[PDB]
Design a protein around this ligand. Structure first.
Ligand SMILES: CN1CCN(NC(=S)Nc2ccc(S(N)(=O)=O)cc2)CC1
Ligand SMILES: [Zn+2]
Length: 256
C-alpha cells in the first residue's frame, strides 16, 4: 500500500522493494558543475508527429496519458540510446506549493513539477519484457516552472475534472505531446530507475535542461486531484514526488 504519506512514503518503500536502496536509483540531484559534456552522445530524436493518445487515467499516484504503442510511431531515438524506444505514457509529479514538486533537482533546485515521457525499447518486444532489462526503458524528463501558461497543456488540465479520483479514466484521443516540449533539446543523461515502486533499475534518464512554463492556474488544477477513490475522504494529490537518491557509481553526462 505504498504512497507518499508519512506512513507509506518513500522512506518506507525499501521494506517491500529493497531495490529502493540500490546502486542506480532515481531521481538524483544534477550537479551542473560536475556533469561533463560527452562528445560520444549522438543527436537526440524526438519523433512524436504520429503519436496516438488513447486515454487519461488517475491511478491513485498520478494521472497517466496513455498512447497506442501497438505500432511504431511516437518514438525516442539517438542521444545516449541504442535503438528505438516507443512512447507508452506520460505523467507528472508536482508539489503542494510552487517551490517543490520535481523529482530531479538541478544544483539542489526544486521545480514546481516534472513531466515524464515514458518509452520502452522495442527490441524486447513488449513493455513487460523490457522492464526486465538494464536498457529496457527511456524516460524523457522535463521540468515545469510557474509563469506564463503552456497552451499545449490546457487540454490536459481541462479533463482533470472528469478523473478526480483513483481508478477514474476518460477518453483522451488526438492529444499531441509535441506541445509539451521546450525549444531546446539540450539534456543531461544517466542510468537510473523508475521513481515509483517497484523502482526497477531499467531506465536511461534524459532530462532536459530547459524547463517549460505553465501558469499558476494550470498547476492549481493538478492540485485539485485526489489520491483517494470516489466517495472516500479527500486527500489532495499533491507532493507525489520522490526526493533525490544517492548518485553512487554514476556520472551524469551533458549533451551540451
Ligand atoms: C508493477 N507495475 C510495473 C510497471 N508499471 N508501468 C509503468 S509505465 N511504470 C512506471 C513507473 C514509474 C515511471 S517514472 N516515474 O520513473 O517515469 C515510469 C513508468 C506499472 C506497475
Ligand atoms: Zn514519473
Amino acid at each position: 500500500h505504498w504512497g507518499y504519506g508519512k506512513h507509506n512514503g518513500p522512506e518506507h518503500w525499501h521494506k517491500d522493494f529493497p531495490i529502493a536502496k540500490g546502486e542506480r536509483q532515481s531521481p538524483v540531484d544534477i550537479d551542473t558543475h560536475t556533469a561533463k559534456y560527452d562528445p560520444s552522445l549522438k543527436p537526440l530524436s524526438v519523433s512524436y508527429d504520429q503519436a496516438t493518445s488513447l486515454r487519461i487515467l488517475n491511478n491513485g499516484h498520478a494521472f497517466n496519458v496513455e498512447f497506442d504503442d501497438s505500432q511504431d510511431a511516437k518514438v525516442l531515438k539517438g542521444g545516449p540510446l541504442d535503438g528505438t524506444y516507443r512512447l507508452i505514457q506520460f505523467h507528472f509529479h508536482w508539489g503542494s506549493l510552487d517551490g517543490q514538486g520535481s523529482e530531479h533537482t538541478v544544483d539542489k533546485k526544486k521545480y514546481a513539477a516534472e513531466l515524464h515521457l515514458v518509452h520502452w525499447n522495442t527490441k524486447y518486444g513488449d513493455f513487460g519484457k523490457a522492464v526486465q532489462q538494464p536498457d529496457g526503458l527511456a524516460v524523457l524528463g522535463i521540468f515545469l516552472k510557474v509563469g506564463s501558461a503552456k497552451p499545449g497543456l490546457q487540454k490536459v488540465v481541462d479533463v482533470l475534472d472528469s478523473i478526480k479520483t483513483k481508478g477514474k479514466s476518460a477518453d483522451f484521443t488526438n492529444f499531441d505531446p509535441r506541445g509539451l516540449l521546450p525549444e531546446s533539446l539540450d539534456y543531461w543523461t544517466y542510468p537510473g530507475s523508475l521513481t515509483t515502486p517497484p523502482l526497477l533499475e531499467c531506465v536511461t534518464w534524459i532530462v532536459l535542461k530547459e524547463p517549460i512554463s505553465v501558469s499558476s492556474e494550470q498547476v492549481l488544477k493538478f492540485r485539485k486531484l485526489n489520491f483517494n477513490g470516489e466517495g472516500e475522504p479527500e486527500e489532495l494529490m499533491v507532493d507525489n514526488w520522490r526526493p533525490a537518491q544517492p548518485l553512487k557509481n554514476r556520472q551524469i553526462k551533458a549533451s551540451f
